[PDB]
Ligand binder design. Sequence first.
Ligand SMILES: C[N+](C)(C)CCCCCCCCCC[n+]1c(-c2ccccc2)c2cc(N)ccc2c2ccc(N)cc21
Ligand SMILES: C[N+](C)(C)CCCCCCCCCC[n+]1c(-c2ccccc2)c2cc(N)ccc2c2ccc(N)cc21
Ligand SMILES: *[C@@H]1O[C@H](CO[C@@H]2O[C@@H](C)[C@@H](O)[C@@H](O)[C@@H]2O)[C@@H](O)[C@H](O)[C@H]1NC(C)=O
Ligand SMILES: *[C@@H]1O[C@H](CO)[C@@H](O)[C@H](O)[C@H]1NC(C)=O
Ligand SMILES: *[C@@H]1O[C@H](CO)[C@@H](O)[C@H](O)[C@H]1NC(C)=O
Ligand SMILES: [Cl-]
Ligand SMILES: [Cl-]
Lengths: 534, 536
Amino acid sequence: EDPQLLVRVRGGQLRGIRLKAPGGPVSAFLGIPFAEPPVGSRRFMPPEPKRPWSGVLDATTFQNVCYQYVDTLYPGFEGTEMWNPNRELSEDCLYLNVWTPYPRPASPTPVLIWIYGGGFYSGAASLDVYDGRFLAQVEGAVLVSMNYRVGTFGFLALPGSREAPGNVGLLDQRLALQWVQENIAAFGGDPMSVTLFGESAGAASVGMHILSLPSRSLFHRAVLQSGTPNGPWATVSAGEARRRATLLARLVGCPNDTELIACLRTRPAQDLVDHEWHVLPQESIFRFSFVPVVDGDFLSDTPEALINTGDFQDLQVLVGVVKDEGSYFLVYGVPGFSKDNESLISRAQFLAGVRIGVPQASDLAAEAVVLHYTDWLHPEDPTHLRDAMSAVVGDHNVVCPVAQLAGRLAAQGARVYAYIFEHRASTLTWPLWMGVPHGYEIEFIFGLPLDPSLNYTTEERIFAQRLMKYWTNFARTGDPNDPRDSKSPQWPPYTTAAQQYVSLNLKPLEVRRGLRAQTCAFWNRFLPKLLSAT
Amino acid sequence: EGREDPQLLVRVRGGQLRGIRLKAPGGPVSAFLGIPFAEPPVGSRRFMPPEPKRPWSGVLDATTFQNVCYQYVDTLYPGFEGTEMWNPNRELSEDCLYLNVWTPYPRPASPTPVLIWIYGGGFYSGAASLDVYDGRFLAQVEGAVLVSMNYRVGTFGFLALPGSREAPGNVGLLDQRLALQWVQENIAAFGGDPMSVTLFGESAGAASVGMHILSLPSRSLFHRAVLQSGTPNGPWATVSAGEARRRATLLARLVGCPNDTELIACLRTRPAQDLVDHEWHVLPQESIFRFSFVPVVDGDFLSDTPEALINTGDFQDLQVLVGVVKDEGSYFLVYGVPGFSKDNESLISRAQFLAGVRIGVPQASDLAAEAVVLHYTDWLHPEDPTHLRDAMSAVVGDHNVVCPVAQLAGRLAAQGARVYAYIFEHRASTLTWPLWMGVPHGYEIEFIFGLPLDPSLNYTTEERIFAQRLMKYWTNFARTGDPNDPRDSKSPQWPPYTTAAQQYVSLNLKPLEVRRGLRAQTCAFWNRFLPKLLSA
Ligand SMILES: C[N+](C)(C)CCCCCCCCCC[n+]1c(-c2ccccc2)c2cc(N)ccc2c2ccc(N)cc21
Ligand SMILES: C[N+](C)(C)CCCCCCCCCC[n+]1c(-c2ccccc2)c2cc(N)ccc2c2ccc(N)cc21
Ligand SMILES: *[C@@H]1O[C@H](CO[C@@H]2O[C@@H](C)[C@@H](O)[C@@H](O)[C@@H]2O)[C@@H](O)[C@H](O)[C@H]1NC(C)=O
Ligand SMILES: *[C@@H]1O[C@H](CO)[C@@H](O)[C@H](O)[C@H]1NC(C)=O
Ligand SMILES: *[C@@H]1O[C@H](CO)[C@@H](O)[C@H](O)[C@H]1NC(C)=O
Ligand SMILES: [Cl-]
Ligand SMILES: [Cl-]
């Protein structure tokens, strides 16, 4: 045995495993259950806390991945496989993971809680890019990551019903957060300093915890990477959720809510996943079938209303985007795009792409988008049109929604820091035209380049160390700047006045002003006004 | 005759004329001023098409400028050179259809290309006798034969009751056309080549030139054209027959008048000054860069809207030179946008900006106005007074001149014409308007005409060299349809404007510089998006 790998939490004893990190050992407690398996009659229902266990629970291996659709667009392709489940799929998946320095910290250490992305229909805390050993070893951080239900299992809703209230996947995350308040101290973590961070749907999830009162007492700071609670894809109305739920029911042979849900519960998991994608209202990209719902409960109102009228006085937030938020999504549905060629498109393909990229847009609105992104000096140039289609998708779904959030949070009392990540991993396997795709800053924040066997450049390894510092400094103090180091340059807070943000790349920090200011004014101020009349 | 300068006696279709020998910096020039080309359009001729001037007896004296067409006189800034320089400099009268001719002295031995100037003034003012349109420099230095004509403005030249016989509209344009025919028939007597006539004009004059390009009967009277800061298409150069009818009958009511015959007959009994006194009271909304009586789409002179005509016209054998000045809109702001004055910096608030936009784009809906505001707002400093002031200027300039010009250059180029484009960026050292206005509408004219060559005018030496360059460009273009000088490979060339490369040059003290895209993004907003917003 080894007293450093043995811990006692409210539900019982656990035994972790000593793991090897480039510069030393780390303690890892993997696959800890935080809820009763949400199986059988518990499908679609809120999670219940895990009942106490006897003996020493083995926490040396990752638990199962929540049941979800598996990507098959590019079989054998590293670029896609790296996001696919790396453990058995099962509805019994509510487990979390903890990494801590070895030996366990002498004094309470700030805690970082990761919430993965995957459009609310996929993902898992066991993926290699979320490996928390690096942050634990190098920065002495206590890192936690939980699995939460996705797809229909976590978000199918029949608003108002008792058996399928919606947002249970968000409640899974919340329960994991409560578990941290109650047990993290046993691992040397400071429950009084918990920072949530996540990417994409994970970022939107973090945003939702910021906007839901019951979550606010479970964390202190937040980081949203390439994702927000507001925006066109992160939420749906109660009406739209009901529509999709009943439509999915129909597609699988079911059928009063109770009856419908009861029948949905008798169906095999893969049956539900098989039809998940057939409930989307129009042909589109960056749209997901089962996502959080404005239930008037977890979310008292739309994220839009909540961020416009919220008081964020004592909150510190770090937000940012990658250089090419939209490239990735284009190959999943826009005619003319592929990872295998340059994807130089025609102007016609561009107008077609926009209708798919902004599925909710009227013809006039679509026209405005086209006229705004067309480069009138080279209106027919294939390369510009291709890069413009990427920008439309990235701006509409991430950048502008992020600019919007940064602005409201800053205007309403929060301390905000913003960035744009611009370094493309030397090991990226997607084509060059995609630039720095959605999700590729993660491996750097988690510190993977510090693993010699991964073949990153020496520069990349120094870069990752910088980023890890920023994130952990932010977790420690609510300020990413190094408290002691007297000449940086400094990363200034983001404000509505100066709108300052920094570029994260191999070069030293560079301060810039206005995050796609003109273009986001188009998306955030004009387009809305357009559709509410037309 | 007997003792007179034999070089100043000339005969034209209507009779004998005696000109005057004038002095130009580098030598003498011949000037024939105040030649009548039409019967005085007075009394029962008011509002009617011009009739050719009947022959006269004896030697008509053509040594001084004739009357200025009856028009509104600006008094916004009494005593101010900036405004006075455009005011009438001869007696006002409805008897005003006269033209002027400048030629080298002695008159050219072989046929010389002819340049015909058509003045601007929003179709409500102007005169060919203003100092900035003095043709002596172009005649003396480039050996050009320059002609300029007065044409009726305001109600006298554009009030129309479409379909009627007594006030068909566009008579001011017909006055111009009659002067062009007069040139075809008589310019040879002065040594001008009737087979090489280039029309050039600025603002309403440029719009006029554009309308001659779009009206078949005028096409046989000229060969090349220059449009400076103006176009026949755009929001101010024309009105629909319905709108002209409305304005004319409203003006009729305002002066006590009331069937078209009755109305027009009553209008003809009214004193000229009474018509001018109510001219401005017929505009549909509060606005700037909008004029009461302008060319009407009558389905005659203009068979269709200038927009339709430039989109479907064949401009195969046409060479055109077009351009704008650096700050087309500044000037207009002081005539109606609250917060703007020539006497202070005109730093404005964001609220004043939104209000200025409603006045500057008077025909825009609330949604359209918001679109303009959102497009011109600098979101990094949305409240900065200086940027707002400069943005208000840009809105007015782009909507009324720059984008309409870009639209025109594009259609002409795509449809067979040879087009050359420029942006004039030099501010006269002698300008009396405040610095914030930059290079205002109309201030490139004194340079094209060569005034800086006159020592007494106090222009800098560089300005004088600049003027000489411009005169060369314009006359080269008039001679060959190409502004470039064949005997000179050093000076960078001025490339034609094409839909593909969209090249145009900057005209300033520096040597020519080629640029691409004339306000391409912003004009796409005005020319492609705003309209579509309108179709809903
Ligand atoms: C009116 N009505 C609803 C009847 C028809 C209207 C068409 C709207 C649906 C389009 C959804 C966007 C394409 C996504 N899309 C589809 C799909 C869904 C419906 C139609 C065509 C394709 C897909 C389908 C299956 N079975 C399995 C995997 C995938 C898939 C996987 C990943 C991903 N990112 C997108 C995907
Ligand atoms: C529907 N209803 C008729 C009841 C109201 C609509 C009237 C709005 C018209 C505003 C015209 C823009 C200001 C021009 N504007 C006006 C004027 C016209 C109407 C109302 C207020 C001012 C002016 C007035 C007089 N008497 C004499 C000279 C000038 C003037 C002179 C030069 C210039 N460039 C512009 C000028
Ligand atoms: C600039 O001027 C605008 C127009 O006001 C006129 O000019 C000023 C200088 C005074 O002489 C006044 O009597 C005139 O009516 C003003 O509306 C504007 O506020 C002025 N700008 C500022 C803020 O100084
Ligand atoms: C790229 O491949 C896609 C599908 O494989 C195809 O539709 C498109 O035309 C190709 N583009 C190029 C660069 O040829
Ligand atoms: C030109 O300058 C002279 C010398 O100062 C002055 O007497 C004259 O009035 C000026 N004339 C002009 C055009 O301003
Ligand atoms: Cl005016
Ligand atoms: Cl006025």
